[PDB]
Structure 1
Amino acid sequence: ATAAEIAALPRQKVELVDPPFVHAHSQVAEGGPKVVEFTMVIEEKKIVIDDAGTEVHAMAFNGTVPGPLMVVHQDDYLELTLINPETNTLMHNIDFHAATGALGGGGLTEINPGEKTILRFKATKPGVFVYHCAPPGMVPWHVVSGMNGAIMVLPREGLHDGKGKALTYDKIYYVGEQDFYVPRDENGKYKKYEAPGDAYEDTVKVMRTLTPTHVVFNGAVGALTGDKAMTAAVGEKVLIVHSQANRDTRPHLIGGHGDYVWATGKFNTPPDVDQETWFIPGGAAGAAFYTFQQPGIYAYVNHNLIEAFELGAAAHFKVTGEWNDDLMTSVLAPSG
């Protein structure tokens, strides 16, 4: 498009919603290309990540780990106002894997406390994509402090299967998975620090072992379990977007499947089908489409089961509806 054509595009502000929920959007694009405007304030804050009171100095887009999911369509522009309050102590920026140029935007968005910036980029490629902070020389430290999320760039005509039939979800969730590297003292007790920088050297030592102390969904062990389980109903079509900005994961819906899975996260790459466990490499997002067929509690996990059940990477779905004995039945219940 020419300069006048770009300047003439409608601008639309969108209010964000905290994960695993997702802001208002249409699957099929509404009108022609738009400049979709988002604002996020960066928060540095101590968060508790497990049932033992373990603290991380989180660095959180919009105050959440992961940062919120931003949704646009192919050939829209995403225009982000990024704000770094004066109360923060570190410089931050943002790299969109969906974007082209300047390291994904990081080169143009380096903001000190008390600064803001506005970045626009054209969303040329459909898919789910990681975004993360990336201050030169301190990239993994910000990322593993929770400073990452994802965006979804929908095809203008919505999702389709590998044969071109439309796939329309009834709901969408965004599960961001976070590897944390929390230092311990010589007694094995997790350490606490006054300021984020105080933890830097000890944390890098743990990072270098390549062994996270915690692997969590939505910023904490059990954050998506119990009264915070995700929900669905038999017959409901759900899209589950999953990201991991730094480390591999292998999502699995225990009791279900990935009917269609864009394992690479990219909608122009045909989805795998009938998946038991899919694979998302560190630095990427993926998306799975499932139609629920049975009610009950499902577990949604990283299927390294030590990571899932010892280190924190397990969520639940609570699903309503009628049991289907054709699909599964207890012929003889546990009996002596």
Structure 2
Amino acid sequence: GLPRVAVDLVAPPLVHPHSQVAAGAPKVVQFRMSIEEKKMVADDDGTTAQAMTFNGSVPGPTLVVHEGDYIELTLVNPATNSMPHNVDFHAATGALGGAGLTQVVPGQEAVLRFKADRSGTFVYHCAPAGMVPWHVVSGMNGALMVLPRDGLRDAAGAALAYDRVYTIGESDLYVPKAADGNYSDYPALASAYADTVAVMRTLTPSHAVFNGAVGALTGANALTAAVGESVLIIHSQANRDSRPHLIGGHGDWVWTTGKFANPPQLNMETWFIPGGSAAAALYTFKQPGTYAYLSHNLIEAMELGAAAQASVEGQWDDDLMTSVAAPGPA
């Protein structure tokens, strides 16, 4: 030389713791882681897944820281586981982130460282090579955151714150188934891867868721818171885207993207985120119760898953518302 620281871580958702613102310164831281892977479961038924893561868871853791510172871481792976991982982151720168470096494988470880610167929330995440895505888616891653220183614121310135936171894451896833348808388962892882891848491619897823598962957150778991418170948330895723948312518530513030620186826105519702890344947112618450957271789409958330838851617491018122018446028838 520176110172350183360480831381712890925791787981888711938651975161850891821381612161925102411161014163112180720167530183470194550381952481560780581980891764784981496983498986788981897712848902318820059972378923488962495987896954992966870182620690364990888803898602892863977260871381935171611131711106400146640185861271460282370580891673581881274980071985046990197987695978490887690583881581991447976001944040850172280069390488890538770282991744390459870281790577690782198983066992181983590584460480780384870185720174941161920137712120816110962112895513880491795995991867590885080839594977990456696977990972891331597974798971993974877450876130870281850163823151610124011171714290937151618104637109114107013112310141713111818251319280718391948471975271968530888411895732997506894928697973596968076978033939018858268923778913597937495985055991281992590887086986697973292839287937887843295938578924993735386709893209779608399955588932988504947140954291892882478905548920987771828721118950127990778921988350928581218260018314017043515030818361923151964160878321894441890675891958894818887513968206876220928451428911019731818303946112317030935121951122988404997340870153822171720117411113934121416010118110828203838802947112977104994217995927990868993360974111954141814131818221617160018122018323118470428950718530838831977631895403919205628803378916995814518911168906797938894513878502968641938361718771818251317280018281119521019436015025616002019522019823017146119632229814018636016567």
TM tier relative to shorter chain: over 0.9
Residue deviations 1:43-75, cap 9 Å, x none? Answer: 000011110111111111011100000000001
Indicate which of 282, 287, 296 corresponds to 2:280.
287
Count the aligned residue pairs. Answer: 329
1:214 and 2:204 aligned: no
| Residue correspondence of structure 1 range 225-240 to structure 2 within 5 A | 225-240=218-233
1:91 aligns with 2:84: yes
Amino acid of the structure 2 residue aligned with 1:152: M
Matching residue of 2:148: 155
Deviation at 1:29, TM superposition (A): 2.3
Taking only aligned residues, the RMSD between alpha carbons, in angstroms, comes to 0.6
Please name the residue that 1:242 is paired with.
Answer: 235
**2:36 counterpart residue number:** 43
Q: CA separation in 1, counterparts of 2:98 and 2:63?
A: 16
Per-residue displacement from partner, 1:123-177 (whole Å, max 9, x unpaired)? 0100000000000111000000000101100000011111111110000000011
Aligned to 1:298: 291
Q: TM-score, normalised by structure 2?
A: 0.99
Amino acid at match of 1:190: Y
How far residue 30 of structure 1 moved from its aligned partner, in angstroms, is: 4.6
Q: What is the Cα deviation at residue 187 of structure 1?
A: 1.6
Which of 54, 58, 73 aligns to 2:47? It is: 54
**Which residue of 315, 318, 332 corresponds with 2:308?**
315
Q: Indicate yes or no: 2:22 matched with 1:29.
A: yes
In 1, Cα distance between equivalents of 2:305 and 2:22:
37
Paired with 1:283 and 1:276, the residues of 2 have a C-alpha distance of 22
Q: Deviations over 1:103-128 (max 9, x none)?
A: 11101101000000011110010000
Counterpart-to-counterpart distance in 2, 1:132 and 1:30 = 31
Cross-structure match for 1:189:
182
Cα displacement (A) at 1:320: 0.3
Q: Pairwise mapping of residues 244-259 of structure 1 onto structure 2 (< 5 A)?
A: 244-259=237-252
Q: Distance in 1 between matches of 2:228 and 2:17?
A: 22
> Residue deviations 1:220-255, cap 9 Å, x none?
001001110000011100000000000001100010
Task: Find runs of 4+ consecutive structure 1 residues off by over 6 angstroms.
Answer: none
Q: Indicate the SS of the match to 2:213.
A: coil
Partner Cα separation in structure 2 for residue 186 and residue 294 of structure 1: 50
| TM-score, structure 1 as length reference | 0.97
In structure 2, relative to structure 1, the CA distance for the partners of 1:219 and 1:30 (3 Å cut) is farther
Q: Distance in 1 between matches of 2:112 and 2:325?
A: 61
Where does residue 68 of structure 1 map in the other structure? 61
Aligned to 1:171: 164
Alignment of 1:82-161 (within 5 A): 82-161=75-154
Q: 1 CA distance for matches of 2:65 and 2:30?
A: 10
Give aligned-pair identity as a percent: 69
Q: Which runs of 5+ in 1 are unaligned?
A: 1-7
Unaligned runs of 5+ in 2: none
Secondary structure (helix, strand or coil) at the match of 2:37 reads: strand
Partner AA of 2:52 in structure 1? M
Q: Which amino acid aligns with 1:119?
A: L
